[PDB]
Design a protein around this ligand. Sequence first.
Ligand SMILES: CC(=O)N[C@@H]1[C@@H](O)[C@H](O)[C@@H](CO)O[C@H]1O
Lengths: 171, 171, 171, 171
Amino acid sequence: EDPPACGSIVPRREWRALASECRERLTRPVRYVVVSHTAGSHCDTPASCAQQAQNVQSYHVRNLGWCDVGYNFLIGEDGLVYEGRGWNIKGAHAGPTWNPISIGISFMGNYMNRVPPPRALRAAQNLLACGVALGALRSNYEVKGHRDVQPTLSPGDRLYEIIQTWSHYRA
Amino acid sequence: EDPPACGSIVPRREWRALASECRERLTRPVRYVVVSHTAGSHCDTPASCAQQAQNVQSYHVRNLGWCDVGYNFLIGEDGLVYEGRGWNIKGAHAGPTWNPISIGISFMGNYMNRVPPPRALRAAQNLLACGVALGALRSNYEVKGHRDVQPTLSPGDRLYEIIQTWSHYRA
Amino acid sequence: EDPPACGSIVPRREWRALASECRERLTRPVRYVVVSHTAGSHCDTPASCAQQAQNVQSYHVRNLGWCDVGYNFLIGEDGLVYEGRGWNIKGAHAGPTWNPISIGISFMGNYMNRVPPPRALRAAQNLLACGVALGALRSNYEVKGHRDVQPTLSPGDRLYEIIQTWSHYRA
Amino acid sequence: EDPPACGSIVPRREWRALASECRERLTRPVRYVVVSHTAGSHCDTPASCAQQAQNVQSYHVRNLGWCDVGYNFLIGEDGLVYEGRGWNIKGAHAGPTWNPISIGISFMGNYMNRVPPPRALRAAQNLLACGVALGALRSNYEVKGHRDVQPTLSPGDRLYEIIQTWSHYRA
Ligand SMILES: CC(=O)N[C@@H]1[C@@H](O)[C@H](O)[C@@H](CO)O[C@H]1O
């Protein structure tokens, strides 16, 4: 019953998220984390980043007919984590084989030629450790890059470069 | 005026494709066509494009553990079409919703800031007219840009701009 | 919204349904469809089935005190669809979580050790396509078994196996 | 192999139809629709109507020596449409002048003194809509009564006075 406050996550409520229609649950503890980037434009302020989390959701919900933004979490260059489908709802970010067994976090921006600032990277790792402390992720979870499970440039070369060094990454 | 009347396709063996291990079939006539790009590099000769079709397949078969290259057909800038999974086999290029009901054709290259050459676009429209002539594609099939059904930049800003002018493009 | 008033539905007055007292509405377009069975007596003729539809409403209204037959539509082995609360009104067939966001259709009979006849499955499917055309359902709607969203045997072992092969089925 | 047909048509084989041998094709989109009655017995259940469709085809095949049942589609009082020669084959229901430019639908029964139940009327109109839906009929298609293109009592007094009230009816 150990209680920690590892969630310095901006709530859907707070980034003006449209309401989710998703009902399918992940079974904890989740063993995989798949890292992607939106490939889109980036933000570096709480205000713009909240606004960007919105556009990403608008795209998935309005243009694509999805029950909610596809990621469980989004990482801003502002150093904040934006709540997506969360720890308990199966996301739609890495395909039918990986979605039901993973948490998909995506960095807001295109990282083919830039690396996300340290605070975005710090936000991501602290987010994952958080998950472990909650029991949402296996203490020994594995990190995959989006391009490792689906044909895509995601999460971007430079950021892909970075996640390959991470302690929990696995081929 | 009689039977086998359509398009020139570089066959699997001619580009050295690894044997296909896929078996799930499409239901002809197919109604949808999803246009993508590889997002990687391009080619402009029988030899380089036949080399590239191989890589793309390699990526999808080794690195992604798939039964065959994800696309039904790949388009080269050498103005030729490369047999992928073909007309009758369910591909893996657009998600579990569109894959079973569409034919995915991928242009080899990256077209965000670059358009395919005239002959690659002819090769592609010619392939479709061929799909119709054979009863593999509905007479009134619909063309979709990858970004219209999956979150991605595919098939690149420029190509995306082009397929939307197409007779069979339905938003 | 659109001109294709669709398919054939036996209207309320024809199967002689007591007037409905329901008022809550579903929001168009609806994302989910929950298939169930009545676990009651089966019928195979326009006359026998109308009677059966009447019995189900009767049980729901008179004994369970609902504002109307719980299902949005009922499906007879006579191969005809029967109107229930319709496409616009919130039904009562899958609990508090699902009734507000779904369309519940029910095959009239006990499909534990029987399958409904081909025509019944055809009417059921036609109804859904019709729903899409009308805009009552999402083009990318989802079909769920009653047992997937509630603790029940419904819609029967046989029919459950059958709805799993529907292109819109998502577990 | 995908969801069944609009109009919930009973397929040739489901009513144990003898294989067709007709080859002349209709040039859909077709302009006219001719409504006739079989002047045979009527039926009001799928079982009795499957047998009636069998009987009508057998009289056309065994006795008149035709390539198949004359009507493109048959309608039962059970409220189902039965597949005849379908949307693509020239019929043999209205004469050398009409069969080449029409779709012939026939109500199973004698409607001189009787009327067909609403469900039979509904299947018919829906079948017609399902026609254009598929693109087998022209948008502004015209409905003619059998006795409007040939000297005959078909489709009977009662049914004839009804189809006059239909919206797409003519002279
Ligand atoms: C809305 C609708 O019914 N559309 C029809 C459908 O019945 C059929 O399954 C499909 C494939 O042939 O052709 C469409 O025209």
